[PDB]
Amino acid sequence: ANFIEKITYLGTPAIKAGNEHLEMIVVPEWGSNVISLVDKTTNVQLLREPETAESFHDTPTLYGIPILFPPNRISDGTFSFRGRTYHFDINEKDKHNHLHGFLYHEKWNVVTTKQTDEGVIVETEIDLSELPHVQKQFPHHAVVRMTYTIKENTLFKHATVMNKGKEAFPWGIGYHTTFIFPAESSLFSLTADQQWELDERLLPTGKLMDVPYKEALHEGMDLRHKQLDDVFLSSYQKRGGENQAVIYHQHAHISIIYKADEQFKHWVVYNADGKQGYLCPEPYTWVTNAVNLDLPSSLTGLQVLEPGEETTAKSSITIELN
Numbered sequence: 001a002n003f004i005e006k007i008t009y010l011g012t013p014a015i016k017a018g019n020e021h022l023e024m025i026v027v028p029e030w031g032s033n034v035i036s037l038v039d040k041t042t043n044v045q046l047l048r049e050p051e052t053a054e055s056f057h058d059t060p061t062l063y064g065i066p067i068l069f070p071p072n073r074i075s076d077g078t079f080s081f082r083g084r085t086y087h088f089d090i091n092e093k094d095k096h097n098h099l100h101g102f103l104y105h106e107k108w109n110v111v112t113t114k115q116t117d118e119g120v121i122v123e124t125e126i127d128l129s130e131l132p133h134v135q136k137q138f139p140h141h142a143v144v145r146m147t148y149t150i151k152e153n154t155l156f157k158h159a160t161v162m163n164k165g166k167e168a169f170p171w172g173i174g175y176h177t178t179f180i181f182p183a184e185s186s187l188f189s190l191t192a193d194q195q196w197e198l199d200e201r202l203l204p205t206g207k208l209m210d211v212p213y214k215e216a217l218h219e220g221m222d223l224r225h226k227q228l229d230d231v232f233l234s235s236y237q238k239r240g241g242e243n244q245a246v247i248y249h250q251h252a253h254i255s256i257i258y259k260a261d262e263q264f265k266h267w268v269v270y271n272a273d274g275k276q277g278y279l280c281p282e283p284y285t286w287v288t289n290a291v292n293l294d295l296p297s298s299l300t301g302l303q304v305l306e307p308g309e310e311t312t313a314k315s316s317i318t319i320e321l322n
């Protein structure tokens with residue numbers, strides 16, 4: 001049994017959808033952000049929610065599930081692709097980078113909803129060819145469609161990226177998913193053995209290094225007095241196994257298993273100063289500044305869409321009670 005219900009979320013139109021296990025709220029105008037995700041059995045909110053509309057607009061990448069197309073930093077907002085030079089807005093001033101892409105602060109359209117025994121589906125879409133300021137930076141006819149499915153104890157979250165134009169383009173996508181994470185009573189695990197060395201502008205030097213505490217990270221560790229803003233390489237490419245982050249809440253015994261497919265090659269993990277009570281385990285299909293690295297695409301995760309092609313990158317959030 002499942003429902004869809006149109007609502008107002010802090011003065012903006014939104015769609016609440018759910019079954020008897022999970023409820024989401026997606027906010028199409030706010031970069032199609034999944035702003036709320038509630039575990040129905042225990043009635044716990046899983047995502048960091050904004051106090052007011054105003055605070056959300058202040059930091060739209062730090063609540064719910066913001067969409068990063070493309071994810072993280074591009075040095076000087078410049079790169080070339082197949083002979084051609086691109087200049088993206090340098091919105092991160094102190095580090096002279098473009099940061100977080102085109103989509104987390106634009107209006108997406110609701111394209112359909114569907115309800116059956118197989119679950120409840122909400123689909124949103126945005127066509128970058130309709131955003132003139134985006135076209136000035138990135139003159140290509142990219143269309144991104146999100147497919148959200150709640151089925152049983154899992155929110156599935158699929159991005160389909162389409163090239164509807166006449167020239168090829170590089171792309172990557174990531175999510176700035178922000179979970180409630182009380183430092184005292186939560187544990188975190190991640191399928192990674194290595195991470196990217198970063199310079200003072202948070203750009204990769206191109207070198208990998210071992211994660212010294214990787215056994216701890218594998219099994220589940222606390223993050224008390226650890227400040228993270230780290231680009232981890234998923235262990236999947238090299239060892240197989242899983243590709244996922246796990247948050248465990250110790251009081252309510254809730255596991256949150258955030259899986260991503262083989263295209264999701266990197267995880268940025270961010271917790272600010274470690275005192276803010278949240279955690280962002282961010283899966284990305286390409287590494288920070290991927291466009292500018294002369295490294296194999298199997299390592300960076302850089303991908304290209306030829307005219308007429310499309311790709312679907314899949315991930316999911318499963319709630320288990322134990």
Ligand SMILES: OC[C@H]1O[C@H](O[C@H]2[C@H](O)[C@@H](O)[C@@H](O)O[C@@H]2CO)[C@H](O)[C@@H](O)[C@@H]1O
Nearest residue numbers: 061062072092099202229268270272282
């Ligand atoms: O723009 C500076 C910005 O960066 C830091 O936090 C970033 C983080 O570096 C990124 O990797 C990303 O995942 O999320 C954050 C931006 O939402 C600083 O901690 C932050 O104060 C600063 O605004």
